[PDB]
Amino acid sequence: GKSQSKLSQDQLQDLVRSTRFDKKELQQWYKGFFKDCPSGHLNKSEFQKIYKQFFPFGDPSAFAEYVFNVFDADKNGYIDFKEFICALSVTSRGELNDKLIWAFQLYDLDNNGLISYDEMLRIVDAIYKMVGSMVKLPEDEDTPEKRVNKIFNMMDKNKDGQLTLEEFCEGSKRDPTIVSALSLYDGLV
Template sequence: MGNKQSKLSQQELAELQKATHFDKKELQQWYKGFLKDCPSGMLTKEEFQKIYKQFFPFGDPSSFADYVFNVFDADKSGTIDFKEFICALSVTSRGKMEDKLDWAFQLYDIDGDGKISYDEMLAIVEAIYKMVGYLNAVEGDGGADSSPKVGSMVKLPEDEDTPEKRVKKIFRMMDKDENGSLDMAEFKEGSKRDETIVSALSLYDGLV
């Protein structure tokens, strides 16, 4: 049987209040909801993808959810416990811009080597386009009987209408030393000028 207690202990609450931007009442509510969704007290990758599917029913959020899962899973155990979940949520929803950028850097830096390569950014941007349904518009076969795809409602600027164009544009703007990868300083500097880089994180605003 699941041995998770139904309430956080006073000590756990105190620790989480220190570690996050949530108050005691919010933490208790989140914990209750967390246990309802995963009674074992551990969130698996599949369960995490399901959460995203509720928010993006028209796109395919599975690969983006995988990348985000890897950042939430701070100890790389393959599951997310409540502390990992609420700490990540705290940064992405209520953290200072600087903290959000640190978090976003981890998301884009897939192999964790301290820099973001063109391919890494392309993988994330493709995952975002798929999730939001942008790629449906591009991939729709346009036959007379094909129903309009959701993505076709969204008109992207010409220089961003494919993930490749979007990433090239980002690199043109951010890669100051033109060495084909972004370090933390370049990423932060560029993200402050292009809000959309970090806006992928504010998806959680709907959750909080």
């Protein structure tokens, strides 16, 4: 982005009003579902059933056609509900500290409490995917890897060692850019 989105102001409230509802609630279910049935991938029909259980406000079939329009252009017919929650952070309601934490508890489905570097780059990538569905991807910041590496380089890690929530948040702290990314959307709601 550079100044603001580039779509119909109306559609803006829709996409948002589409992700409305609670979170800590979905998190409880997301962990109980992935724990009883660890799969990672999810089907459309199945997903529709989920949206029809927590907050069937508008048309669940419409929102579905969306997720696929972004997470499914021509890959058979399956998407990862994990990367979805992560991107959800963009469209939600809470503080800033909860976001970083929310993302952590998101990839913490290994009861390890320690994520790997590769996961870090994969996490930001997920958010970078949904970003192409809202704002127009610029043309001077490709390969966000170099950026993520800087963080690890900032704290000086094993370029591969694992990191913890607490520290993960510290790495982003020394980089407000990660803090302004979300701030660049709080004054037109």
